[PDB]
């Protein structure tokens, strides 16, 4: 699973 950064 590969997630976006929270700050994006």
């Amino acid at each position, epitope marked *: *699973y*590969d*997630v*976006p*950064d*929270y*700050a*994006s």
Partner: antibody
Amino acid sequence: EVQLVESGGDLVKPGGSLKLSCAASGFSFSSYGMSWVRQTPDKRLEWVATISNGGGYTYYPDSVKGRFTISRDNAKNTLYLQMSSLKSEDSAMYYCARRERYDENGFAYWGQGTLVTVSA
Amino acid sequence: DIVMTQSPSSLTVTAGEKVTMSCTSSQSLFNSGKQKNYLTWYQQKPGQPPKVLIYWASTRESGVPDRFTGSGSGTDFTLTISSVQAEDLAVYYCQNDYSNPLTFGGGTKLELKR
């Protein structure tokens, strides 16, 4: 005890390329995104790049796009930053810090830096 | 880009006194998914990388002294050290952890009186 150890920084002509590695141990690497923050000799800290825990999303500031590339090898547990089109203003200590995937809370784990001096 | 503005850049203290430094954002950092203002405070001592004192504007890291408090919301935030010791003369920065580019403040440096 999480352990991020940077490498690669040398004296590099304004222009040339350099790639720094950052070996990380003591956490499931694949689970976290990583960053490179930079601190200038005027003792100013600067975000330089973030990358996904998986690799597919990369994020840069207007000042690094085109010249640097954050990269990781989850099989070898290592971050990379290929730096090209090196400038004078880029001389600094380069740190890798890990991203807080779970808690979304500050850069909690820092490496011990590597220094790069761009000069001829 | 949220600019970070910390004033003062140098604060001169006496050990045992209370001291408060300010951090200002250009926009809000309140993240409504976590329901938290995503500001982080860091301390750094010469030779070291920075270390978290306070995250989510006011939560203290496991191991930071009781004397270090983070307070504030939206665009106006403060660090307060209830009674400064000499193990506290370091530089303090805030950081915008809310959206890219991530921006750190300029630092405030504790210098000791004599």
